[PDB]
Structures are given as structure tokens and as C-alpha cells.
Design an enzyme around this catalytic site. Sequence first.
Site, PDB file in Angstrom:
ATOM      1  N   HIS A  42      -1.024   3.647  63.412  1.00 32.16           N
ATOM      2  CA  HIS A  42      -1.011   2.195  63.175  1.00 32.16           C
ATOM      3  C   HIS A  42       0.371   1.593  63.408  1.00 32.16           C
ATOM      4  CE1 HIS A  42       0.343   2.866  58.898  1.00 32.16           C
ATOM      5  NE2 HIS A  42       0.968   1.734  59.162  1.00 32.16           N
ATOM      6  N   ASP A  88      -5.170   8.358  61.374  1.00 36.01           N
ATOM      7  CA  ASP A  88      -3.952   7.594  61.484  1.00 36.01           C
ATOM      8  C   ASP A  88      -2.758   8.542  61.709  1.00 36.01           C
ATOM      9  OD1 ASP A  88      -2.195   5.508  61.571  1.00 36.01           O
ATOM     10  OD2 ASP A  88      -2.191   5.084  59.430  1.00 36.01           O
ATOM     11  N   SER A 185       5.343   3.201  55.727  1.00 36.92           N
ATOM     12  CA  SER A 185       4.193   3.780  56.432  1.00 36.92           C
ATOM     13  C   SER A 185       4.677   4.435  57.727  1.00 36.92           C
ATOM     14  CB  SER A 185       3.040   2.783  56.640  1.00 36.92           C
ATOM     15  OG  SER A 185       3.376   1.808  57.616  1.00 36.92           O
ATOM     16  N   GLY A 186       4.048   5.557  58.060  1.00 41.30           N
ATOM     17  CA  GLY A 186       4.416   6.446  59.148  1.00 41.30           C
ATOM     18  C   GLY A 186       5.357   7.563  58.711  1.00 41.30           C
TER      19      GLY A 186
HETATM   20  C1  LIG Z   1      -6.255   0.144  56.569  1.00 40.62           C
HETATM   21  N1  LIG Z   1      -6.922  -0.828  55.699  1.00 40.62           N
HETATM   22  C2  LIG Z   1      -8.071  -0.145  55.108  1.00 40.62           C
HETATM   23  C3  LIG Z   1      -7.421  -1.966  56.503  1.00 40.62           C
HETATM   24  C4  LIG Z   1      -6.070  -1.272  54.577  1.00 40.62           C
HETATM   25  C5  LIG Z   1      -4.769  -1.926  55.002  1.00 40.62           C
HETATM   26  C6  LIG Z   1      -3.908  -2.443  53.856  1.00 40.62           C
HETATM   27  N2  LIG Z   1      -2.752  -2.999  54.590  1.00 40.62           N
HETATM   28  C7  LIG Z   1      -2.465  -4.335  54.387  1.00 40.62           C
HETATM   29  O1  LIG Z   1      -3.350  -5.167  54.213  1.00 40.62           O
HETATM   30  C8  LIG Z   1      -1.000  -4.652  54.452  1.00 40.62           C
HETATM   31  C9  LIG Z   1      -0.371  -3.277  54.604  1.00 40.62           C
HETATM   32  C10 LIG Z   1      -1.551  -2.347  54.448  1.00 40.62           C
HETATM   33  O2  LIG Z   1      -1.495  -1.129  54.276  1.00 40.62           O
HETATM   34  C11 LIG Z   1       0.723  -3.229  53.535  1.00 40.62           C
HETATM   35  C12 LIG Z   1       1.183  -1.842  53.248  1.00 40.62           C
HETATM   36  C13 LIG Z   1       0.833  -1.161  52.060  1.00 40.62           C
HETATM   37  C14 LIG Z   1       1.495   0.066  52.210  1.00 40.62           C
HETATM   38  C15 LIG Z   1       1.405   1.176  51.375  1.00 40.62           C
HETATM   39  C16 LIG Z   1       1.178   1.200  50.005  1.00 40.62           C
HETATM   40  C17 LIG Z   1       1.073   2.517  49.555  1.00 40.62           C
HETATM   41  C18 LIG Z   1       1.213   3.372  50.639  1.00 40.62           C
HETATM   42 CL1  LIG Z   1       1.133   5.171  50.518  1.00 40.62          CL
HETATM   43  S1  LIG Z   1       1.515   2.703  52.195  1.00 40.62           S
HETATM   44  O3  LIG Z   1       2.093   0.148  53.416  1.00 40.62           O
HETATM   45  N3  LIG Z   1       1.930  -1.093  54.095  1.00 40.62           N
HETATM   46  N4  LIG Z   1       0.290  -4.136  52.459  1.00 40.62           N
HETATM   47  C19 LIG Z   1       1.443  -4.754  51.781  1.00 40.62           C
HETATM   48  C20 LIG Z   1       1.743  -6.067  52.500  1.00 40.62           C
HETATM   49  C21 LIG Z   1       0.554  -6.345  53.416  1.00 40.62           C
HETATM   50  C22 LIG Z   1      -0.447  -5.217  53.158  1.00 40.62           C
END
Ligand SMILES: C[N+](C)(C)CCCN1C(=O)[C@@H]2[C@H](C1=O)[C@H](c1cc(-c3ccc(Cl)s3)on1)N1CCC[C@@H]21
Lengths: 233, 54
Positions: A42, A88, A185-186
Site C-alpha cells: 500500500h 500487503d 506503515s510498511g
Molecule cells: C485497509 N483498510 C481496511 C481499508 C483500513 C485502512 C485504515 N486506514 C485509514 O483509513 C487511514 C490509515 C489507515 O490505515 C491511517 C493509518 C493507521 C495506521 C496504523 C495504525 C496501527 C497500525 Cl499497526 S498502522 O497506519 N496508517 N489512519 C490514520 C489516519 C488516516 C487513517
Amino acid sequence: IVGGQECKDGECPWQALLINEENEGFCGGTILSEFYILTAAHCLYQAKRFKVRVGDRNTEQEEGGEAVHEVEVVIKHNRFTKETYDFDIAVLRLKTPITFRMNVAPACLPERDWAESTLMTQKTGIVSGFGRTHEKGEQSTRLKMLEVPYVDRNSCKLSSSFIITQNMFCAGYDTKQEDACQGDSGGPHVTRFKDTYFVTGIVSWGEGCARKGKYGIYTKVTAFLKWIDRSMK
Amino acid sequence: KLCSLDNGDCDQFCHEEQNSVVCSCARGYTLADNGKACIPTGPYPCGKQTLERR
Ligand SMILES: C[N+](C)(C)CCCN1C(=O)[C@@H]2[C@H](C1=O)[C@H](c1cc(-c3ccc(Cl)s3)on1)N1CCC[C@@H]21
Ligand SMILES: [Ca+2]
Ligand code: NA
């Protein structure tokens, strides 16, 4: 990383940082070898073009040991699905090899059966990165790490608004305010065994960060060990 | 002997055979003569924190 602590010198040497068109970090990765980085598929969609930084601990200080490497080949999993983040996982081959040194060393890939019986059955793993320090906050300028308990799959599924596939696992805390977050993430989820750190996960997604009743979701690397080996040739 | 008690005394990977355990190691390590320990072949073996300043 929400909560946790700053990585001490030499303690997170497998951390890589994907930097977008402006030298700004947007995702992590894990150093696997002199030529290969592990990351989430992603992350490939979060920036038109990017490079990989290794050896960094403080993004606002040119310490001297950091290096930037261009990407030669992107190897995305051919079953990655944007809607669910299933599969992913990606590997990056670099244009030039990493020189291992202080703060720059690979994490180990475990054998699959032993990882399942011995690593995934540990109480905790470690996650690290430069991501946000609270859900609606800013990215950390300093590399952080966090011990995260493994969370059983049944509890994982019940907690989630989204499908948890067998290519995913949960880690973190029900209500304790500590988790990975956006910008992590990653990056690496590793598990310690007798002072050696083995790749067990890739930071993948969550519903917010450190929310009550939600966990961090990770790509289950044991499902992909053969895939990684093939991708690295 | 079993991998479920003290990881068969292996430093890294343990696998059970009929009536024994066999230890092995990640790339960048060599299994020691004692059949248990894993010896790095270079100064930045995988999975080791970089704590000794070279
Ligand atoms: C894959 N899917 C099932 C559709 C869920 C996606 C949720 N998504 C979102 O909707 C985005 C992003 C994020 O994952 C981000 C995020 C959350 C995280 C993590 C939290 C715990 C982790 Cl381990 S990785 O990493 N990036 N969140 C915080 C700000 C926006 C939102
Ligand atoms: Ca720096
Ligand atoms: Na939580």
C-alpha cells in the site's frame, strides 16, 4: 509510534524510511540484505516516486551515517488488494548496495515452521518507525520503538470493522494508549529470540491509532517467507 | 529431545527428528561445532543490534 520510546543508538538498525518527492518520510521498510527492503504494497500508492533512507534516527539532524538509495525494482505482491489491504507486501531491489555499519544492518528472515511455533507464540514483538505520535498528531522526527503484545485472532476479528484475513495478524493493546500509526506503515515488526531479531510482520493498517477496542494490523510475514525468498531471487 | 523445551538448546532454528533435535541458523551464521550455537560470519549479521562500535 504512539507511546513507546525513542530507539537507542544501534537498536533499530534494520529500520528503513521511504522518502517522497521532497526527502520527507511517508512509510517505513525493513532492511533484508544489501540490496533488498521489505515494505507494504500500500505504500507504493502513497507517493508517485520515492527513495529509501537507511541509518537515520533523527530526521532533522545530518548525523553523517545516513545514506539514501534509489529503487531499481519494485516487486509488489500480485494479489495485493487496495480495499482490504490483503497481501500487503512488497520487496524493493535497490540500485546500489547498502553498506552495513552502525545503525544499518538487516533483520533476519526466520524459517516458517519455527517462526510459527516459536516466534508467533512469544508474548510480544517490536514495532518501530517515524510515524505519528498520536492519531491526529505529527510524525516523530526521532525513530521510536514499541513492544506490542500478540493479540489472538478471534479477538482480532471481533474488534475489527474490516475483514482480518489469514495474511494479517493483530498486535498491540485493547485500551492502553500505545500503537503504531500513520507513517509507520510498511515498517518492521520483529520478534526477539535470544538476542536475535527476526522479521515477523509489516506494519499494515489500523482504525485510527491507539483507539480503545482496536488493535494494530500487520502483514503476517510467515505466510510470505517463500514469496520473499523468490522475490529476492 | 524436543524443540518445545528450551528450543532444543538451539540458538536459532530447531527442528525435531525421530529421537533428536537438529539446530540450524539464518544466512550469515554458521552452526557451531557443538551443533547448537550460531556463529556470525561477518560483523553485521542479520538480527543483531549494532552495539559494538567498530
Ligand atoms: C485497509 N483498510 C481496511 C481499508 C483500513 C485502512 C485504515 N486506514 C485509514 O483509513 C487511514 C490509515 C489507515 O490505515 C491511517 C493509518 C493507521 C495506521 C496504523 C495504525 C496501527 C497500525 Cl499497526 S498502522 O497506519 N496508517 N489512519 C490514520 C489516519 C488516516 C487513517
Ligand atoms: Ca539524521
Ligand atoms: Na487499542
